[PDB]
Design a protein around this ligand. Structure first.
Ligand SMILES: [Fe+3]
Length: 54
């Protein structure tokens, strides 16, 4: 699945990993993260992530 970078801090939101410590099961697409989900490292909103693909 896809990987996304937090443009602020470099954390990778890896769809295959999810973010279980913050309520997101492995395999959750970035689109499906709640609107108010934030980078678990720096607190940046979803807007600040970029999809790692051409
Ligand atoms: Fe971040």
């Amino acid at each position: 699945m896809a990987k996304w970078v937090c443009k602020i801090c470099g954390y990778i939101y890896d769809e295959d990993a999810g973010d279980p410590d913050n309520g997101i099961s492995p395999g959750t697409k970035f689109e499906e993260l709640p609107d108010d989900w934030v980078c678990p490292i720096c607190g940046a909103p979803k807007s600040e992530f970029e999809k790692l693909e051409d």
